[PDB]
């Protein structure tokens, strides 16, 4: 047992390790999306920049969870980072919809983590999740929903002009 | 024989003279394209600026090859600069596709030059080509491919609105 | 076939995808090492900082390879990022020795990639590897060898005072 | 007929195209001279700089004529740029004398162009020629005549010391 | 075997040691030349400055090769630095011609080193030579050839006025 | 006889040439030491920096003696620079002891030179030696003796921790 460990349940430690893997997976998905939009036959540089930024953000989220795991005296156990579901993301609108799905999945995992911390009476972990992850997820989901709505209203994915102008004016 | 000449094959000297002519020809092609887009019945000022910039860049490439020829003790032999294949470049998309074709032709010539320098065991010439021309060509080809992709997706050449907005937002 | 693809062999494209996976794996290994040294029962903050910096550097190397893959018209195919070989890295000296082993493995992969590009007469790829990866690997290997030498001479891993003072004076 | 064309005779349009070719030819001649003086067995860097500057100036003159052609609604028709008469320019004095001959040829062409514009009652073209080309040619011819006079008086081409000191003190 | 050594052939290590000695020898030759021109009966201060600068440059080249030898895990073996061939360098023109000969000798040694590294499939060593030595040698040879050409054309060595004015205007 | 030579004995001229060779030899010894400490299996960067600085200082001493030789109208005669006695300097303490021995040898040579200049009634040479070399040698010897004393008291060469901390705190 770690000399710093206090009120940190083994179930919470395991769930934090699972969340670390999920954040690294999300980082990998976003990296794949970014370099899909960097292809010469897609060529939407601001979509690529947006998703690269999201990938780095998700890496930071994972690293903050690893720091938490050490702060509480738990032990980090890493697992394989599975490859993303797609190599070809088909369009800016499709990539935004997949990103929305992924962010809602990550949010659900975080809500289950908060429920577990509440059940184990771990207020520090509950506060950590609320302070650093929950409103970040709500804001990310709202932003992606806005992007999806605007692309659809502009005529994406059928309008390449729609995705070009969205790349310029919203993501630029 | 030049007092500075060392490990510089006559075949390499001839191929450098051929490359000088090819770069000057590319400069002339781009100059023609630029002033096509400066016509009152075409009137795409940022296409004109883009191609004028490319023309000056190709002139600089030719001058760097002439400097190399003198540095190695070879002798520059200039030839006629042939007129470009077109007077009317028909559209921004067509001009970008022709520019892509031209840059791939110049790249192929440079790869043949590198093969010759490798065969003649001229590492200074190989390094010169790699350092100053090969990645420049790869970047130029990727940029032109991106431009072609975006124009096609926006609906060029049938959409004059597409070429207008591309002129404003990508080339502006 | 990509509109930008020129002198880019399918074998080279596959080897670049393998190298991308290897760089991401190295990033993951370094991330694991960093947060091992962030544990309360290890508590070497400058070892943790060093390895976190290396992890971000390896991510950048992977992203540069993905950019190259797109520049040449190849297609990125991502694979699972396997978990690192260890969860517990045992000591600063042991982690440095493992890092040296990993960097020499990455260097060997890059040398095989250069041999393949030479065999396929791809001077742009050869130059890319030489310019951005080979001297970086040589410098990294020399630095890690220096660190290992100094830790051993100071008495690591048996001297915790040795690793403490190395953390302060070399990595701080 | 161009929507902007007014009081622009077809003969004037043809003569402007001929002048464009002549200016590009002069640019090429000066480029050849510059890199003759960049040879290791000639090695007069300020002669090389002088003639490179003249080459870029002549390119600018050609581009201004192309802009005029478009401003008036004429159509640019480019022709081959013939190679310069010499590969070896023999001396600084000989190159200056050839440059003087070339500038007087260009001036004669411009005077014939002005005569044509006067005959066609095209005051805008007459003013354009007078404002941008005629005094430039007179100044260039006077400068080259001064250079030739000084080189001859100093003892060029027989005095290599003469050309060395002229390179340093007049062109430097 | 060094813990950092990888893909570094013993033949390459020996050739690098030979090149180190050759660079130190060149530094010594240039030092001798510099202080020849510092004599009261020669008294060409800018020739002296030029050759002193070259001597320090060659020392830097040798030190960079020693750094490379250590970076790759080879072992430096130093040898005697032989005295220069002359104590009296006879004139500025003669010293420049000897310097040109020496730089071409060093260039030939570097080309043989590059051939050896290519034969041993050592791309890091090939790139090191190309990046840091080959174009430096080509530029140095071209500069010395230019200096020799100008001195000869000015009338050196028979004209002491020629060497005086060259010292002032080219080397000053 | 030089037009500037006055009260400069041939014995003094010969002894100055011998001292020039000795200073160049000392520079070479220090260069060898520096790059011994740059090895990956020694890895004491501040020892390497210290000895590289000493090597450049000894080169400067040699050049000042060459300047003196020319100032007095003597003629510089260079000899081979013999290789240093060791390739492997075994430890920081051993290298410092060898440096102390070398500096005392150079000091003895300078004292013999001063005795010769006194015997030949050459006060300018005596003053030159006193002003530029004698106190420099005394200070260098005292500094090296201090370094040796501290390394021994810290437990070098048996304590690698001793040499590591000396490298950091005294030489850093
Ligand atoms: Na997952
Ligand atoms: Na395409
Ligand atoms: Na979902
Ligand atoms: Na959804
Ligand atoms: Na849900
Ligand atoms: Na051509
Ligand atoms: Na083509
Ligand atoms: Na094409
Ligand atoms: Na091709
Ligand atoms: Na791997
Ligand atoms: Na503990
Ligand atoms: Na290994
Ligand atoms: Na190893
Ligand atoms: Na290996
Ligand atoms: Na003409
Ligand atoms: Na010559
Ligand atoms: Na004429
Ligand atoms: Na004339
Ligand atoms: Na006339
Ligand atoms: Na030699
Ligand atoms: Na005299
Ligand atoms: Na030679
Ligand atoms: Na020669
Ligand atoms: Na040779
Ligand atoms: Na000695
Ligand atoms: Na001694
Ligand atoms: Na002693
Ligand atoms: Na003594
Ligand atoms: Zn513990
Ligand atoms: Zn791109
Ligand atoms: Zn996240
Ligand atoms: Zn954070
Ligand atoms: Zn902990
Ligand atoms: Zn635990
Ligand atoms: Zn694990
Ligand atoms: Zn997925
Ligand atoms: Zn697609
Ligand atoms: Zn709690
Ligand atoms: Zn909290
Ligand atoms: Zn909102
Ligand atoms: Zn010649
Ligand atoms: Zn080009
Ligand atoms: Zn350039
Ligand atoms: Zn030349
Ligand atoms: Zn030739
Ligand atoms: Zn010709
Ligand atoms: Zn064409
Ligand atoms: Zn048209
Ligand atoms: Zn070569
Ligand atoms: Zn080069
Ligand atoms: Zn718009
Ligand atoms: Zn494609
Ligand atoms: Zn890497
Ligand atoms: Zn990068
Ligand atoms: Zn692509
Ligand atoms: Zn493919
Ligand atoms: Zn896949
Ligand atoms: Zn591992
Ligand atoms: Zn442990
Ligand atoms: Zn290639
Ligand atoms: Zn490249
Ligand atoms: Zn029209
Ligand atoms: Zn003109
Ligand atoms: Zn202008
Ligand atoms: Zn027009
Ligand atoms: Zn017309
Ligand atoms: Zn035509
Ligand atoms: Zn001509
Ligand atoms: Zn000539
Ligand atoms: Zn008019
Ligand atoms: Zn008038
Ligand atoms: Zn006007
Ligand atoms: Zn003068
Ligand atoms: Zn070793
Ligand atoms: Zn050198
Ligand atoms: Zn250097
Ligand atoms: Zn080493
Ligand atoms: Zn060895
Ligand atoms: Zn030896
Ligand atoms: Zn010599
Ligand atoms: Zn003499
Ligand atoms: Zn290698
Ligand atoms: Zn190569
Ligand atoms: Zn390298
Ligand atoms: Zn004398
Ligand atoms: Zn180092
Ligand atoms: Zn000294
Ligand atoms: Zn000094
Ligand atoms: Zn003297
Ligand atoms: Zn004498
Ligand atoms: Zn001698
Ligand atoms: Zn010794
Ligand atoms: Zn040793
Ligand atoms: Zn005296
Ligand atoms: Zn004195
Ligand atoms: Zn003291």
Residue numbers in the entry:
A (entry chain E), B (entry chain A), C (entry chain T), D (entry chain S), E (entry chain F), F (entry chain D): 5 to 176
Would you copy out the relevant sentences from the publication that reported this structure?
The samples used for testing, hexamerin, human 80S ribosome and apoferritin, exhibited undesirable properties such as protein aggregation and/or affinity for the carbon support on standard cryo-EM grids. The use of polyelectrolyte-coated grids was essential for the determination of macromolecular structures from these samples. Hexamerin, human 80S ribosome and apoferritin are soluble macromolecular complexes with a predominantly negative surface charge.
Reconstructions of apoferritin routinely achieve resolutions of better than 2 Å and the highest resolution approached 1.2 Å. Our test sample of apoferritin exhibited extensive aggregation on standard holey carbon grids, which prevented the use of the images for single-particle reconstruction. In contrast, ssDNA-coated grids enabled the recording of data that could be used to reconstruct its structure to a resolution of 1.77 Å. The DNA strands increase the background around the macromolecules of interest. Nevertheless, the presence of DNA on the grids did not prevent the reconstructions from achieving high resolution; for apo­ferritin, this was 1.77 Å. For the human 80S ribosome, which has a diameter of 25 nm, the distances were 29 ± 4 and 39 ± 9 nm, respectively. It should be noted that well prepared samples of apoferritin and 80S human ribosome do not aggregate on standard cryo-EM grids, indicating that the macromolecular complexes used in our experiments were damaged during purification or improper sample storage.
